[PDB]
């Protein structure tokens, strides 16, 4: 007579997806209700370009499937890139990357009232090892949100 859970979401599939994402080099982590999905940008875009590889749309499809399990209110997609040319260049590149990922995720309908976007360039690194291009550890895209109820 009444729904037995949130529509189209199974805990077993949630754990399976989290394990798979952690397996393929993507990072999925949960702290309380705060979920973080760290994407190595080497597996989403080309070298220092806001261009999605057509081979990476399977990865973004799996991500969008993962985000459809939880009932959230506001996602936040952010980007970070290694230092290439100048502050404006990587800031604009990260903003474009975040916009691309946001519009794709919003197109593959994930129920979220707001999807924020920001590009901080290389202002918040997570490693002291800056050697490398976008193969660098801290050239990534962070999709973070808080499960609602």
């Amino acid at each position: 007579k009444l729904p037995c859970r949130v529509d189209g979401a199974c805990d077993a599939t949630i754990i399976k997806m989290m394990t798979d994402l952690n397996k393929k080099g993507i990072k999925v982590a949960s702290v309380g209700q705060n979920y973080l999905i760290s994407i190595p940008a080497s597996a989403l875009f080309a070298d220092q370009s806001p261009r999605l590889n057509w081979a990476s749309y399977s990865l973004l499809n799996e991500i969008a499937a993962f985000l459809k399990q939880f009932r959230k209110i506001a996602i936040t997609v952010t980007s970070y890139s290694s230092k290439y040319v100048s502050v404006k260049r990587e800031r604009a590149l990260t903003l474009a990357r975040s916009r691309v990922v946001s519009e794709y995720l919003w197109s593959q309908g994930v129920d979220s009232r707001i999807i924020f976007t920001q590009g901080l360039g290389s202002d918040k690194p997570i490693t002291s090892y800056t050697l490398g291009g976008d193969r660098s550890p801290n050239a990534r895209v962070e999709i973070t949100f808080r499960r609602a109820v």
């Binding site: 702290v31 309380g32 209700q33 490693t127 109820v149």
Partner: protein, 193 residues
């Protein structure tokens, strides 16, 4: 062989105990199988090396994280920043900085992990749920964080490598309007680089 409550803050020696037990049982096996002194020595050496290879990756990081994951402690690593999140419902007595001793294994486990990073820097931060006055939450979180810092220092961590702070409901990792989320909120974070 091991004093239960923090083992007098002296270095744990489970590895040598396991190696000695394995050498003894290997000597027993060599005596039983061959019955000759050379056979007994060979069996003892084989048992000792078996105990070495067994307790040698049983004392590696991965099993330590698995074990402290077992009680209630969660380990989250990101880049170089590694965080241990410890609940203050199983590890601190009700509304008091008194450390809980019944959970002496897990806390001991924590020390082991932190001893794999001798050059690290430790931030210990305490968080409590929204109930009570602001000053109450501030004082209680600060007391719990300071107690954890003292415990970390006691086990052999240099006093300059610590910084302990207590936030109130300021940083939140769950919604305080619900029960289980509020339960997840009360915690101690141990960050190191």
């Amino acid at each position: 062989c091991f004093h239960p409550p923090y083992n007098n803050f002296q270095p744990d020696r489970r590895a040598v105990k396991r190696v000695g037990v394995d050498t003894g049982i290997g000597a027993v096996a060599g005596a039983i199988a061959s019955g000759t002194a050379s056979g007994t020595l060979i069996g003892a050496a084989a048992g000792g090396t078996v105990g070495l290879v067994a307790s040698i990756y049983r004392d590696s990081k991965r099993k330590i994280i698995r074990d402290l994951q077992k009680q209630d402690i969660q380990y989250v690593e990101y880049g170089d920043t590694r965080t241990l999140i410890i609940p203050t419902d199983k590890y601190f007595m009700f509304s008091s900085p008194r450390l809980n001793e019944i959970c002496y294994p897990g806390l001991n486990n924590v020390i082991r992990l932190l001893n794999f990073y001798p050059q690290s820097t430790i931030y210990v931060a305490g968080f409590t749920d929204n109930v009570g006055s602001r000053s109450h939450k501030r004082k209680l979180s600060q007391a719990q964080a300071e107690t954890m810092m003292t415990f970390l220092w006691a086990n052999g961590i240099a006093a300059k490598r610590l910084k302990a702070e207590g936030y109130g409901d300021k940083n939140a990792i769950s919604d305080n309007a619900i029960i289980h989320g509020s339960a997840q909120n009360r915690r101690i974070e141990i960050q190191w680089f």
